[PDB]
Swiss-Prot record:
Location of this fragment in the whole protein: 50 to 157 of 157
Phylogenetic placement of the source organism: Bacteria, Bacillati, Bacillota, Bacilli, Bacillales
Effect of residue 100 to Q: Loss of activity
Entry's family note: Belongs to the ribonuclease N1/T1 family.
E.C. number(s) listed in UniProt: 3.1.27.-
Location relative to the cell: Secreted
Keywords: Endonuclease, Genetically modified food, Hydrolase, Nuclease, Secreted, Signal
Protein name, entry field: Ribonuclease
Functional description taken from the UniProt entry: Hydrolyzes phosphodiester bonds in RNA, poly- and oligoribonucleotides resulting in 3'-nucleoside monophosphates via 2',3'-cyclophosphate intermediates.
Active-site positions on this chain: 71, 100
UniProt source species: Bacillus amyloliquefaciens (Bacillus velezensis)
Length: 108
């Protein structure tokens, strides 16, 4: 049950995977997550959307041969998804955004 910037960053770097409270978007849709309805905490209490590949096409995050970027929602409790996201690479560089991928800051 970890969903803070430090909690998830630390977890990833140490255990090389997201904490157990995360599910991908297709998983949550399968489970009855309806975006426009803001009902995640309704169909999946205690769960956050996380683990999907992030394309990086605005090209704002540092790229590299064979490097993959993935994202996870941070600070989510209920209702519509918020604007906080942790971004992590295949090689464990960790960045965060608090304005829907507009700007990023390195945190690890």
């Amino acid at each position: 049950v970890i969903n803070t910037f430090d909690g998830v960053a630390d977890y990833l770097q140490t255990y090389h995977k997201l904490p157990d409270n995360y599910i991908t978007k297709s998983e949550a849709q399968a489970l009855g997550w309806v975006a426009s309805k803001g009902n995640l905490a309704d169909v999946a209490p205690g769960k956050s959307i996380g683990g999907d590949i992030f394309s990086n096409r605005e090209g704002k995050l540092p790229g590299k041969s064979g490097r993959t970027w993935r994202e996870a929602d941070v600070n989510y409790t209920s209702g519509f998804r918020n604007s906080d996201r942790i971004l992590y690479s295949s090689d464990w560089l960790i960045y965060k955004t608090t304005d829907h991928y507009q700007t990023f800051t390195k945190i690890r």
